[PDB]
Amino acid sequence: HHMLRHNVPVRRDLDQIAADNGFDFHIIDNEIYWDESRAYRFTLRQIEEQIEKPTAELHQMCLEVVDRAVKDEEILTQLAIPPLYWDVIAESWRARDPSLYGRMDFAWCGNAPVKLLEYNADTPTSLYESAYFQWLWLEDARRSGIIPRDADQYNAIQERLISRFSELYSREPFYFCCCQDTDEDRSTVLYLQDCAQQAGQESRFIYIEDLGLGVGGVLTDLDDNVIQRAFKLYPLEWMMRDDNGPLLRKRREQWVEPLWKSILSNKGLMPLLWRFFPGHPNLLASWFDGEKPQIAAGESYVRKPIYSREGGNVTIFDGKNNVVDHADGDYADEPMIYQAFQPLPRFGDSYTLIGSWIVDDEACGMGIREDNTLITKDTSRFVPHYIAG
């Protein structure tokens, strides 16, 4: 009936399993990250009616926000998108530059509708864990009897990724890049590279720091080959703030995620979703800093930077304007949005976030994270789930 969590025994060979499968960040700084000492059990109806169908519909609503924003200079201004990039973002949308993936983050409310907290539509991680490692967990768990033998999992992510790379096939090499000094980012990009290569797409990896420029600002690799298409685990808004940002206007190279996705990874998406779909069951009231609050006196509320990751610089306020929770981060100088407050559900002493995956426009799986405060932070743990009943 109700979604629940229960303890399960950790596999006695977890560390070997993680090594054999390339999961080199399952423990981070000698702290547990991958946490299979518990698991969440959903019914198929909860999956289809409360997560999958709402995710697919919310994505369509977001595409309507993109379409409205690129045609309205007041909206682009509210989103704080630099005017230099308005034309090339509008053109990116006009050409329908292809999207690969994105992840929506949800507050679970029991039998009530889930509430969308934000759309990590540019550089989401926890992909390897959601698409791959928790499926191997499911297979082992079914065999060992710690969950029902016929348990399923809301997870078609790898299949949809491979099929998308097939659709996007090109004989020109497909570059993949991330920054140095983060195993998680590299393994996210390596996982996408493996999916691409499974679809027959030749792929090459290059660190962001090793990207070069040829005469006239042409993007090149370390052997001075011209990069014509790249997936980047690097934020679009930093690309546009960089001194070389103006070179994006020429559209000489293809980017994944594409430029128009900068509208969806902007947390200004949340006020716009509320403006254009007021009262939608899966939405929270939201407004830009400086607009009249859309909650009554007394209610708690959340202030978020328009650009941030892992709860960075998020503050939850109570209705007396005291701090309920706060997270450090590198985003303190970004403009801010406000949102009505729906607490994450609490299981034991953990607060649980649902990440719901989109591949192109299709809702196709979810991964769960747990943390010790109301704001999901960098200390969070990934927890497997399964479907039964």
Swiss-Prot record:
<keyword id="KW-0460">Magnesium</keyword>
<keyword id="KW-0067">ATP-binding</keyword>
<keyword id="KW-0547">Nucleotide-binding</keyword>
<feature type="binding site">
    <location>
        <position position="311"/>
    </location>
    <ligand>
        <name>ATP</name>
    </ligand>
</feature>
<comment type="function">
    <text>May be a ligase forming an amide bond. Shows ATPase activity. Despite its similarity to the C-terminal synthetase domain of Gss, is not a glutathionylspermidine (Gsp) synthetase. Cannot synthesize Gsp, glutathione (GSH), or GSH intermediates, from GSH and spermidine, cysteine and glutamate, gamma-glutamylcysteine and spermidine, and gamma-glutamylcysteine and glycine. Does not bind to Gsp.</text>
</comment>
<feature type="binding site">
    <location>
        <position position="118"/>
    </location>
    <ligand>
        <name>Mg(2+) 1</name>
    </ligand>
</feature>
<feature type="binding site">
    <location>
        <position position="118"/>
    </location>
    <ligand>
        <name>Mg(2+) 2</name>
    </ligand>
</feature>
<dbReference type="GO" id="GO:0016874">
    <property type="term" value="F:ligase activity"/>
</dbReference>
<feature type="binding site">
    <location>
        <begin position="103"/>
        <end position="105"/>
    </location>
    <ligand>
        <name>ATP</name>
    </ligand>
</feature>
<feature type="site" description="Transition state stabilizer">
    <location>
        <position position="103"/>
    </location>
</feature>
<dbReference type="Pfam" id="PF03738">
    <property type="entry name" value="GSP_synth"/>
</dbReference>
<dbReference type="GO" id="GO:0005524">
    <property type="term" value="F:ATP binding"/>
</dbReference>
<dbReference type="InterPro" id="IPR005494">
    <property type="entry name" value="GSPS_pre-ATP-grasp-like_dom"/>
</dbReference>
<dbReference type="InterPro" id="IPR016185">
    <property type="entry name" value="PreATP-grasp_dom_sf"/>
</dbReference>
<feature type="binding site">
    <location>
        <position position="105"/>
    </location>
    <ligand>
        <name>Mg(2+) 1</name>
    </ligand>
</feature>
<feature type="binding site">
    <location>
        <position position="120"/>
    </location>
    <ligand>
        <name>Mg(2+) 2</name>
    </ligand>
</feature>
<keyword id="KW-0436">Ligase</keyword>
<comment type="similarity">
    <text>Belongs to the glutathionylspermidine synthase preATP-grasp family.</text>
</comment>
<feature type="binding site">
    <location>
        <position position="267"/>
    </location>
    <ligand>
        <name>ATP</name>
    </ligand>
</feature>
<keyword id="KW-0479">Metal-binding</keyword>
<feature type="binding site">
    <location>
        <position position="339"/>
    </location>
    <ligand>
        <name>ATP</name>
    </ligand>
</feature>
<feature type="binding site">
    <location>
        <begin position="374"/>
        <end position="376"/>
    </location>
    <ligand>
        <name>ATP</name>
    </ligand>
</feature>
<feature type="binding site">
    <location>
        <position position="304"/>
    </location>
    <ligand>
        <name>ATP</name>
    </ligand>
</feature>
<dbReference type="GO" id="GO:0046872">
    <property type="term" value="F:metal ion binding"/>
</dbReference>
<protein>
    <recommendedName>
        <fullName>Putative acid--amine ligase YjfC</fullName>
        <ecNumber>6.3.1.-</ecNumber>
    </recommendedName>
</protein>
